[PDB]
Design a protein around this nucleic acid. Structure first.
Ligand SMILES: [Zn+2]
Lengths: 107, 125, 124, 95, 242
RNA sequence: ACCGGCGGACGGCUCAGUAACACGUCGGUAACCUACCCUCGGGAGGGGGAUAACCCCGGGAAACUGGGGCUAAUCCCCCAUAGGCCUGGGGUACUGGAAGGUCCCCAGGCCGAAAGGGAGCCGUAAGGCUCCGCCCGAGGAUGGGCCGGCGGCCGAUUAGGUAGUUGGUGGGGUAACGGCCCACCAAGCCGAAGAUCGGUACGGGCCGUGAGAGCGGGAGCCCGGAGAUGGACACUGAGACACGGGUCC
């Protein structure tokens, strides 16, 4: 099934209502790529994105990182160190507002 | 009142100081512990925007549906088990996930009696 | 304890005022709002007052009153006590707006020596 | 005092005609409203009872003054549309 | 500090599509809710007073409007806060004048004179299509107007199509589809008031809007939004669009 | 003058508090409310009831306020039908990038409308026309609510902070999603790339200066946010926990 992204659906299936592929969750908004740095909590991962910010006065770049908490569907068991793709959705908890949609590279 | 606004603590663990008073639009209401009784009791609540809500406080009947789409109105006897809270089952409090016993057997609730005003359930096979 | 009795005749819309000094005020003291007593023990004739021929079984029903300080009596307040109550409707409060509420001082249903004016209705 | 009619516009929604004109008068004071109205009526055959001078404006170091007038089809329409103050200023109302 | 809806509008905060002197006065007419949006409409008072000059003061402009001497589409409007939007027809029968409200090259609203035969036609872009009770198809147009058709004609209408409706009788004359070679008129963006024919349509993942390529009369190809492309004909514009 | 309707939640003032999704910008609400206004599709059937004003009598220094009688409404209430909300079983007709959405057919239930009122012109009458009106459904529009990515301040003579805290399973509540709250299950979450704590400060468009890089300010005008002696609460209303309404300390 296609949900608005040009990526392959998960091979397996799940019964999670919060999984955008096999549930009722809808994705709408930003789509980001990152690296999983934490997966200890249940159905929750921490996604880290690195980007360069330009400092005008010094005419030089400085490295900055962005950390985002995303839901982890049972179909896509993203582990720490995996290159992952996340999509914006409705609020799921106090800090979770994104959902993992695919695993591009396995660590 | 039951304030349902932002939390007072940051995810890091810091403290947040409110920059404004509580707003009327962020207030909730007391829970409606729908209890099994002999006569149904319901009230009408005027809500945000002039809308209407039906609150069921006492429930005596239930609409139990089978797998073929047939529904029957029966009487609730007791709440066998309520996974939401450990005291609801013993206090006979009906919620969305409750399991009740009626004249035709075991039924699992599927409606929200506090927001609907009626009790609907599916027969357990 | 002196009383000013406002007797109202429902069948004609007229009202009359009578003064009670020191004997029938005791008789009236202790009754609540809605209690019916015959008019014959109040030491009043009621015939030459209204120019009428009222029946022998005429009675006075206490409908309300005001005390020394000009405060009314609420039938829903028990006891001869003066209290401050947040009122939105009824005796002692005039809304004047849509849904406003104001705190006022009202007296109880029971008649007290502090009551000055007592309003009663003739019952046939 | 020479009057040149720069523009005449026909308003039909409000039954009137709007006249923009200029008054050339070097070495003379600003012409009075009565004189301006009299000359305009005599030149454009307008009804004296339904004509009103909105303004006569003089400028810095200029021998020409601008003038605006309105001629209504009916006196009742003129009373209904025009404000009371302008009618008082032009003398159409004793008030 | 804000406790409810606003009721005023400062001149400096007025929409950029108005021909208004933003510093002559302090207050501007706050448009009443109506057919079009805030950025594609102007209150009828400004059209009566500033655009056409038929009145000098708001008082006499309101008197003219109350006398029913101004017509928008085919219906008389007496509200001086009534919004007048894109592709609207303003008619003054007492003077026999008909104008089409259109954006210019810098996005400002202007009145373009038209003829009596064209004054009875108002194009409407189908903004959305849905179903109502009784299995009937409801079409919602770019100016908020609605029409209802039977389920039999569900395949004759689609989004981004144009319906030529006769006003005020509200009768559908014909339907102009959105396809290759269809004449279009850009109503918003950087290429406002530009016209041409459809060349290609590009679609994107997620909720990003579709883009359309238009070839103008000079052969130049320029891109814009599909919702900004307004079909006005099949091969030539069926309405005067200069 | 009174009843009744609408408005009084906008405008006007100030910068106290706030280092925070408060502000700027770009995106979401497929997770939400909206009186006044616009369009289309429908309806306005049958009944009851008080009271203001006015009259009689007053109480109180006032502020305010009591009893009886007699009345009308676009005032209030009831019945019916339309209609809304939930759940169960089926068909896939629609918009969308994608349907917990819309539409259609059965079933169990709860909630549940209206002012055919007013004016004018005709018409013997009946009845007709025009204007301003009332209720429901589907959309808009207008003003908001909530959410996300990014950006913008100093102090390490402040190095550990958090315990509803981080996440989940089931619910309650809300107009809405959400530890917002509750029951249960785990130990998570933040941090030397400056956590926590402390100081200062309404944020922006902009303003001052300098050849420029930059440095400094951000009261007056505009947009956004807060406050009404310091706090805490509620009623009515689409909109407030409300500067010229209410209660308590
Ligand atoms: Zn899945």
């Amino acid at each position: 099934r296609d949900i608005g992204l040009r990526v392959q659906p998960p091979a397996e299936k799940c019964d999670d209502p919060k999984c955008p592929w096999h549930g009722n969750l809808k994705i709408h908004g930003r789509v980001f790529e990152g690296i999983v740095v934490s997966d200890k909590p249940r159905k929750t991962v921490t996604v880290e994105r690195q980007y360069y910010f330009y400092l005008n006065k010094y005419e030089r770049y400085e490295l900055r990182r962005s950390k985002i908490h995303a839901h982890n569907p049972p179909c896509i068991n993203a582990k720490v160190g995996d290159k992952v793709l996340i999509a914006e959705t409705r609020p799921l908890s106090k800090t979770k507002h994104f959902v993992v949609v695919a695993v591009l590279e396995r660590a | 009142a039951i304030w349902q606004g932002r939390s007072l603590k940051k995810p890091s663990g810091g403290r947040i100081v409110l920059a404004r008073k509580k707003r009327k639009r962020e207030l909730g209401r007391e829970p409606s512990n729908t209890r099994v009784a002999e006569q149904d009791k319901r009230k009408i609540i005027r809500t945000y925007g002039g809308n209407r809500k039906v609150r069921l406080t006492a429930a005596a009947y239930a609409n139990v549906f089978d797998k073929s789409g047939k529904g029957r109105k029966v009487r609730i006897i007791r709440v066998i088990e309520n996974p939401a809270n450990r005291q609801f089952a013993r206090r006979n409090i009906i919620t969305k996930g409750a399991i009740i016993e009626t004249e035709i057997g075991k039924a699992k609730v599927t409606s929200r009696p506090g927001q609907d005003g009626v009790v609907n359930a599916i027969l357990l096979e | 304890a002196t009383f000013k009795l406002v007797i109202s005749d429902p069948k004609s819309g007229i009202a009359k005022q009578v003064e009670i000094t020191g004997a029938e005020t005791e008789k009236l003291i202790g009754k609540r709002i809605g209690d019916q007593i015959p008019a014959k023990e109040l030491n009043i004739n009621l015939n030459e007052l209204f120019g009428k021929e009222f029946p022998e079984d005429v009675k006075l029903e206490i409908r309300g009153g005001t005390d020394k300080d000009g405060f009314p009596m609420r039938p829903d307040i028990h006891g001869p006590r003066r209290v401050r109550v947040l009122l939105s409707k009824g005796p002692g409060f005039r809304p004047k707006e849509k849904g406003e509420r104001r705190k006022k001082t009202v007296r109880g249903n029971t008649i007290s020596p502090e009551i000055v004016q007592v309003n009663v209705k003739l019952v046939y | 005092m020479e009057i040149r009619i720069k523009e005449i516009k026909e308003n039909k929604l409000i039954g009137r005609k709007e006249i923009y004109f200029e008054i050339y008068h070097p070495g003379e004071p600003t012409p009075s409203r009565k004189d301006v109205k009299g000359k305009l009526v005599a030149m454009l055959d307008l009804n004296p009872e339904t004509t009103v001078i909105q303004y006569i404006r003089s400028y810095f170091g200029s021998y020409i003054s601008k003038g605006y007038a309105k001629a209504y089809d009916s006196k009742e329409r003129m009373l209904y549309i025009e404000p009371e103050y302008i009618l008082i200023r032009d003398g159409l109302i004793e008030k | 500090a804000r406790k409810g809806p606003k009721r005023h509008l400062k001149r400096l905060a007025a929409p950029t599509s108005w021909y208004i002197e933003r510093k002559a006065y302090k207050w501007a007419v706050r448009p009443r809710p109506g057919p079009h949006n805030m950025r594609t409409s102007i209150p009828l008072l400004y059209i009566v007073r500033d655009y056409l000059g038929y009145a000098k003061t708001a008082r006499e402009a309101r008197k003219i409007l109350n006398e029913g001497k101004f017509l928008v589409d085919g219906r008389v409007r007496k509200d001086y806060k009534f919004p007048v939007g894109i592709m609207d027809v303003v008619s003054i029968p007492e003077t026999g004048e008909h104008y089409r409200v259109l954006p210019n090259r810098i996005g400002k609203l202007i009145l373009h004179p038209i003829s009596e035969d064209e004054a009875f036609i108002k194009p409407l872009r189908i903004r959305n299509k849905r179903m109502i009770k009784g299995a009937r198809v409801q079409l919602n147009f770019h100016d908020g107007t609605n029409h209802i058709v039977s389920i039999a004609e569900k395949d004759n209408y689609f989004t981004s199509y144009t319906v030529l409706m006769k006003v005020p009788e509200r009768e559908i004359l014909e339907v102009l589809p959105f396809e290759k070679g269809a004449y279009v008129f850009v109503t918003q963006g950087k290429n406002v008031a530009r016209k041409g024919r459809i060349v290609e349509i590009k679609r994107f993942p997620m909720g990003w809007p579709d883009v359309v390529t238009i070839e103008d009369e000079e052969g130049e190809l320029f891109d814009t939004l599909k919702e900004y492309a307004f079909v006005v004909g099949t091969d030539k514009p069926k309405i005067s669009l200069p």
